[PDB]
Design a protein around this ligand. Structure first.
Ligand SMILES: *[C@@H]1O[C@H](CO)[C@@H](O[C@@H]2O[C@H](CO)[C@@H](O)[C@H](O)[C@H]2NC(C)=O)[C@H](O)[C@H]1NC(C)=O
Lengths: 123, 534, 227, 104
């Protein structure tokens, strides 16, 4: 399961904040998915769910999709919109993952290595 | 960050001072360096006193440092201050180079005075004070008035003809006592920070004019440092006097722009973020009281004030009392679930933690009440007392027993929703709070309803369970102050654990429970009452 | 006839749990019928003493007085008395020893200085200075350890306590070790250990080789992948 | 205000992050990943056997520790290596760091 954020150019029309959750290369089908927002399941119509069409190159595995929109103004509080997958073949039958604005990729690092004998400690 | 102490401390030369800084009570912080260092514009703490013994050459005899691992504290005492000691300092532990530390500011000033014509007058804010001033014998009928010399000019605060400063109007009285006494007094109410200054007496308009220059200082309360962990609890002791007993009380918290936001009122007002987890005890003979706050969060640290006012809020010139609060975030309080969901007719099970060392105390359980000044009466304890309204459907129990015990409550209903507190008789006092929500559905357990029965026979009552309770052990128990005990050899495949009573007397009257075990934890139960007929 | 009363080290106890206490008399006359008795403060005698000394080769004659006690007794701190009763001076001399009370606990701070580069230019021998500091009470014990084999003490010499100039109570000590420079040039680190009754598990230690101690050279080669 | 993505106290790494909510323009903000490492250049490679060489390489597969051979003495959990003493030989404990191995 992955959760791709919207596109940057999506975030210039200034209304549609698309979000994509997903699932990859699994057997068998019948898997259920849903999106969770702060311990609160979303509107079932708010998202739209795919069906498990089969893999292109894998022998017989399956994958499906689901997409959801919100106000892009909301894509400033973020709250990471946790998408709760629900598949039978999981140790606890749920493999939740989530993604927000702060997640993803930054384009301003500042690595800050320091260097000293006064170490070996990790305060 | 996990170190905590007072921000700024002021004193004047020749005096002593004593500073306390706090650390989490873990093993290393009870057994490792503490230091007091001084920085400057040169880049580095220079150590001045250490817990290992070393005292700076400039501080020999002046100061020392002591550690109370039991309080989770170390104390720094400085005596014989001077103006050369005012600067920026830091308490801290471990290697000075890192920052397991806390910054302290220090300002020392000379001891003023030398003016026999003006004495010191330090009082508290919002209080009452009075100044006594003599006049010579010819001051029989002559102007009695005070004058505040504010910058360029002196102004008037109370005359001998009924006028009074509109900044000060209504807070003041002039007294010339009889019995041939040759003094007078001026009484002021509603002491404010906008009152601190230099006064001047006067005795008459004439050349005599027995003036007496005066000072007016106002004592804002010195904050008190409180150290509590995350998801813990705190008890504040507000200590106002009997002189505001009729007046209401309040509690605010400092903010940015000199603006308390109120958290609870004697007028029942209460902050929505702090709903539930706040208590307020009735006031004492002196009006003394205490405020209990449970489950503190990261933004709850800061300065706190408790006061007394007609509106129960902040105003200029009202008595106050201050606290400084710190939340650990290097905490040892176990993270327990805070919200617990149940259905109508269902059960709930609650795990309640406490400090492992006082396991032989008497656990308690209380229900929070709003729509009031806030109340919270008991519901059950560990000796077995239970509130009279809940016979049968409620029991607590020490199954885990390692600082954690379990509580089982079944037959849930949507009217019961609210907030619940856990208490102990130990000196350390966690009050973990859990909320019960009610949702839609039917409980997983299935048992027949309330049934009557004839005396002296064999009767069997069933209890089926769903497939999710299929991996456990199953049991029936008989509810009482002692709680559960199972009855071994009543079973099937994954359903229908059934109670059987070979012979029955009316001594077997009461409620019985059917439930499952989680190895060493408890789960869902259900209850049914049985009568006896003939 | 001079008597040394020898209390066992806290280290000797803690590595033996066998708190033998002894007193030696040095350069007396070894007659036979040399008699010394261990008694408590009460006057009551205690267990005997076997394997006693004999005549020394160089007339510095000796006699070891062995004894034993329960460790808590010494922790309790009561006076102990071995008294010499020999015909040389049949007057019974009094050797009374105890444990001081009121001494606080304080820890060794074992630094470990490496040999001065100058000494590395005389081109034979290298010296390392294990140090202990700021500790109470007296009587630290130390030895040196390297490559998992102990170093028989004739390599190293150790100080005894003597008060700090600055610390009113805390003593310190030293240790010195001499080694061929090529041996220290070999790499071949060294570990000095200290045992002392303010130390948590009773035993700390530090080590140094050529690279750790005062290197002219800092060679970090750090890699940071997948920012 | 930052958000500690990782805080590995046995590598002294600490990846935080903080959205620099810009001047109140539209959503032309850039999120920001601060990083910090304090490499010791004093310790062993076998952190708990002071009879090994020191260290040269310090490799940070941040992927691995965005989730066991890590090389700083963590302050709170302490270490030891049983060490022979001779008074006769005895094979006996130690406390390779103080002020954290205190059974208290
Ligand atoms: C090298 O490191 C490893 C693990 O980091 C050590 O392995 C064990 O360490 C524990 C520590 O208490 C010992 O009790 C075990 O006996 C060690 N096992 C083995 C096989 O040695 C290892 O000790 C370190 N190297 C050395 C020489 O001690």
């Amino acid at each position: 399961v992955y959760l791709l954020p919207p596109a940057r150019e999506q975030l210039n029309l200034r209304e549609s904040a698309t979000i994509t959750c997903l699932v990859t290369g699994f057997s068998p089908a019948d898997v259920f998915v849903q999106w969770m927002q702060r311990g609160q399941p979303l509107s079932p119509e708010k998202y739209v769910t795919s069906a498990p069409m089969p893999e292109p190159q894998a022998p017989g595995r399956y994958f499906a999709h689901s997409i959801l929109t919100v106000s892009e103004e909301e894509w400033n509080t973020g709250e990471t919109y946790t998408c709760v997958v629900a598949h039978e073949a999981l140790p606890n039958r749920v493999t939740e993952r989530t993604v927000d604005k702060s997640t993803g990729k930054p384009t301003l690092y500042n690595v800050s290595l320091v260097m000293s004998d006064t170490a070996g400690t990790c305060y | 960050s996990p170190i905590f102490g007072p921000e700024e401390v002021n004193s004047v030369e020749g005096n002593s001072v004593s500073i306390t800084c706090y650390y989490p009570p873990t093993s290393v912080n009870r057994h490792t360096r503490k230091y007091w260092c001084r920085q400057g514009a040169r880049g580095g703490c220079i150590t001045l006193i250490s817990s290992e013994g070393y005292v700076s050459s400039k501080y020999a005899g002046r100061a020392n440092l002591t550690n109370f691992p039991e309080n989770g504290t170390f104390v720094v005492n400085i005596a014989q201050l001077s103006q050369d000691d005012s600067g920026r300092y830091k308490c801290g532990l471990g290697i000075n180079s890192r920052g397991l530390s806390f910054d302290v500011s220090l300002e020392v000033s000379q001891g003023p005075g030398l003016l026999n014509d003006t004495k010191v007058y330090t009082v508290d804010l919002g209080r009452t004070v009075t100044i006594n001033c003599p006049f010579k014998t010819e001051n029989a009928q002559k102007r009695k008035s005070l004058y505040k010399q504010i910058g360029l000019y002196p102004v008037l605060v109370i005359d001998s003809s009924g006028y009074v400063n509109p900044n000060y109007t209504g807070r003041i009285r002039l007294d010339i006592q009889g019995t041939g006494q040759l003094l007078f007094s001026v009484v002021i109410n509603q002491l404010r920070l906008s009152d601190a200054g230099q006064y001047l007496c006067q005795a008459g308009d004439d050349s005599n004019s027995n003036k007496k220059n005066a000072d007016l200082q106002v004592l804002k309360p010195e904050p008190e440092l409180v150290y509590e962990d995350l998801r813990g609890s705190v008890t504040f002791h507000c200590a106002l006097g009997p002189e505001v007993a009729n007046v209401a009380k309040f509690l605010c918290r400092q903010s940015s722009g000199e603006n308390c936001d109120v958290v609870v009122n004697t007028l029942g007002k209460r902050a929505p973020a702090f709903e539930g987890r706040i208590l307020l005890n009735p006031q004492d003979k002196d009006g003394s009281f205490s405020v209990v706050i449970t489950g503190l969060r990261k933004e709850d640290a800061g300065r706190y004030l408790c006061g007394a006012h007609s509106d129960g809020q902040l105003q200029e010139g009202s008595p106050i009392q201050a606290w400084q609060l710190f939340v650990n975030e290097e905490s040892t309080i176990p993270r327990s679930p805070t919200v617990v969901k149940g259905v109508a007719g269902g059960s709930v099970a609650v795990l309640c933690p406490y400090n492992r060392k006082e396991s032989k105390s008497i656990k308690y359980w209380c229900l929070w009440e709003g729509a009031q000044n806030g109340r919270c009466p008991l519901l059950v304890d560990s000796e077995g007392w239970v509130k009279a309204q809940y016979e049968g459907r409620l029991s607590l129990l020490e199954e885990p027993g390692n600082g954690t015990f379990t509580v089982i409550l079944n037959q849930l209903t949507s009217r019961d929703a609210g907030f619940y507190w856990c208490l102990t008789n130990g000196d350390t006092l966690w009050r973990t709070t859990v909320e019960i929500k009610i949702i839609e559905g039917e409980p997983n357990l299935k048992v027949p309803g309330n049934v009557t029965a004839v005396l002296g026979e064999t009767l069997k009552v069933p209890c089926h369970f769903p497939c999710k309770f299929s991996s456990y052990e199953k049991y029936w128990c008989k509810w009482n102050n002692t709680g559960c005990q199972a009855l071994p050899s009543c079973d099937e495949n994954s359903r229908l654990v059934s109670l059987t009573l070979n012979l029955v007397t009316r001594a077997d009257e009461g409620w019985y429970w059917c439930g499952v075990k989680q190895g060493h934890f408890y789960g869902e139960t259900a209850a049914v009452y049985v009568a006896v007929e003939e | 006839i001079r008597v040394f009363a020898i209390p066992p080290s806290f280290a000797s106890i803690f590595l033996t749990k066998s708190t033998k206490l002894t007193c030696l008399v040095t350069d007396l006359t070894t007659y036979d019928s040399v008699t010394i008795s261990w008694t408590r403060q009460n006057g009551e005698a205690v267990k005997t003493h076997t394997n006693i000394s004999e005549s020394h080769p160089n007339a510095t004659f000796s006699a070891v007085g062995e004894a034993s006690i329960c460790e808590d007794d010494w922790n309790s701190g009561e006076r102990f008395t071995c008294t010499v009763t020999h015909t040389d001076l049949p007057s019974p001399l009094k050797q009374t020893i105890s444990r001081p009370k009121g001494v606080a606990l304080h820890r060794p701070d074992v630094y470990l200085l490496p040999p001065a580069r100058e000494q590395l230019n005389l081109r034979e021998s290298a010296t390392i200075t294990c140090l202990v500091t700021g500790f109470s009470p007296a009587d630290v014990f130390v030895q040196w350890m390297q490559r998992g084999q102990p170093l028989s003490p004739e390599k190293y010499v150790t100080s005894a306590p003597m008060p700090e100039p600055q610390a009113p109570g805390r003593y310190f000590a030293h240790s010195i070790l001499t080694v061929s420079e090529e041996e220290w040039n070999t790499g071949e680190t060294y570990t000095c250990v200290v045992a002392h009754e303010a130390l948590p598990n009773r035993v700390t230690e530090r080590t140094v080789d050529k690279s750790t101690g005062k290197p002219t050279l800092y060679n970090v080669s750090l890699v940071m992948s997948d920012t | 205000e930052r958000i500690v993505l990782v805080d590995n106290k046995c590598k002294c790494a600490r990846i935080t992050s903080r959205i620099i909510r810009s001047s109140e323009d539209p959503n032309e903000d850039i999120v920001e990943r601060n990083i910090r490492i304090i490499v010791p250049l004093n310790n062993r490679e076998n952190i708990s056997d002071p009879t090994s060489p020191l260290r040269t390489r310090f490799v940070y597969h941040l992927s691995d520790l965005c989730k066991e051979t890590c090389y700083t003495y963590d302050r709170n959990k302490c270490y030891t290596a049983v060490v022979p003493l001779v008074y006769g030989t005895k094979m006996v404990e130690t406390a390779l760091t103080p002020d954290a191995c205190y059974p208290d």
